[PDB]
């Protein structure tokens, strides 16, 4: 009936002054735009169909044509930026915001989905969706005593759309918009559905990706213990955004970092630093580097949780990107740590895996490792154990590597290696 119609046929039907012919032609468009292989999105746009579909959204008396035009437009809006712009230029945003008030849950859900694709395009369309007043009718759809009474697919679409209103930077979402959405986000962060939890975490990860003022807004809502609980989930789609949110928070103040430690995040790190997914190990090691960039009492919490042997582990064997993040964790620790904490680090066997990485063809990691060697030597000066450390570096072939680095292309590497050889190996 409405399967495999040409764009020409769809235009003929939509241009008839017959509501039923228009409904059949809109369903035919929807079925075309729903096909897996190459939907003719640009052909539908060039035929001037978008304003016609947008005007069908207003046909309150024909709920089927509202659903069909809403689905058709959602599939166009899910395309490239140009294809999303075409939907916005067709006047779809206020028309989709009105549809959130529809008594039909399947039409209302379609409007949610469409707005999520529009807001997801970038900052400008996100902020345009907010200026047309989408947040209040969206949040009113979740104004229920228990989220479990809502349809699973419906709740997942709403959470996803709200996460897209939290997404993108330059600029970040309006503060006022973030303050309005956050109490609903916190509630979704406690829902039992894994997809709702994954998208709620992603929303939190976006809001924590900014200045300390933005991290504060989130931390003050008391979500860090719930993020730490989600950090221990079995589902990788929940752990990934949970770890990103936690990692972002610790880029903030020492006080914000402390909320993460107080919530018990460090107890999850033995499994995160040995996780079979390399992006988890990498981001967990990145999170560690920002905690070792903190206070001496925070470095002490890292020590007390038995995480130093785990940092020795990731430095010894991991994918290069994780090893680079481990080198940063070691330099940060040796920069802010006490003599006792640096002594402990060397005792745990950091020297051999640290010297082995001086063979990597990456100038940033060499600089980071050279800064770490320098800091460790500064602690050995305070103990008069410089000779003992010099022997350890010689014994695992580190001296031969630092000597070679004197004839390096990079100025900073050449100068740092030259200093260590002249100060402790001459």
């Amino acid at each position: 009936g409405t399967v495999n119609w040409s764009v020409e046929d769809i235009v003929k039907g939509i241009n008839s002054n017959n509501l039923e012919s228009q409904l059949q032609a809109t369903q035919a468009a929807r079925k075309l735009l729903s096909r897996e292989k190459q939907p003719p999105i640009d052909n539908i746009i060039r035929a001037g169909l978008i304003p016609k579909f947008v005007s069908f959204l207003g046909k309150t008396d024909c709920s089927p044509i509202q659903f069909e035009s809403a689905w058709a437009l959602t599939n166009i809006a899910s395309g490239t930026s140009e294809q999303t712009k075409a939907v916005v230029d067709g006047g779809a945003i206020p028309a989709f915001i009105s549809l959130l008030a529809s008594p039909h849950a399947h039409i209302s859900e379609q409007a949610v989905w469409a707005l999520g694709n529009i807001a997801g395009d970038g900052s400008a369309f996100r902020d345009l969706v907010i200026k047309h007043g989408a947040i209040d009718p969206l949040l009113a759809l979740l104004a229920v005593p228990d989220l479990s009474t809502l349809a699973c697919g419906y709740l997942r679409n709403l959470t996803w759309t709200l996460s897209n209103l939290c997404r993108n930077k330059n600029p970040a979402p309006p503060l006022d918009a973030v303050e309005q959405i956050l109490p609903t986000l916190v509630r979704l962060l406690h829902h039992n559905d894994p997809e709702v939890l994954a998208d709620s975490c992603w929303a939190i990860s976006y809001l924590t990706d900014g200045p300390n003022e933005r991290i504060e807004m989130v931390v003050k809502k008391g979500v860090v213990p719930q993020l730490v609980k989600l950090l221990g989930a079995t589902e990788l789609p929940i752990v990934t955004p949970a770890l990103r949110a936690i990692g972002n928070i610790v880029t903030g103040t020492d006080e914000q970092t402390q909320k993460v430690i107080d919530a018990g995040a460090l107890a999850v790190f033995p499994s995160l630093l040995t996780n079979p997914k390399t992006n988890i190990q990498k981001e967990a090691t990145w999170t560690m580097s920002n905690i070792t960039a903190g206070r001496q009492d925070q470095i002490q919490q890292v020590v007390n949780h038995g995480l130093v042997p785990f940092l020795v582990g990731v430095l010894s064997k991991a994918d290069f990107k994780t090893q680079k993040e481990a080198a940063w964790a070691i330099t940060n620790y040796t920069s802010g740590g006490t003599v006792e904490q640096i002594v402990y680090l060397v005792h745990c066997g950091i020297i051999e895996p640290l010297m082995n990485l001086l063979s990597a063809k990456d100038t940033k990691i060499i600089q980071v490792i050279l800064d770490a060697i320098s800091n460790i030597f500064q602690a050995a000066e305070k103990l008069g154990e410089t000779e003992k450390l010099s022997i350890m570096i010689e014994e695992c072939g580190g001296l031969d590597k630092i000597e070679a680095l004197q004839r390096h292309e990079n100025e900073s590497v050449y100068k740092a290696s030259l200093n260590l050889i002249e100060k402790y190996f001459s």
């Binding site: 990706d209 990103r244 990692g247 972002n248 610790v250 880029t251 903030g252 990498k282 990145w286 580097s289 920002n290 960039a293 990107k321 993040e325 940063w328 940060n332 920069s335 802010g336």
Partner: peptide
């Protein structure tokens, strides 16, 4: 000392 996701990756 502290680095953002963009600073690191």
């Amino acid at each position: 000392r502290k680095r953002t996701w963009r600073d690191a990756f």
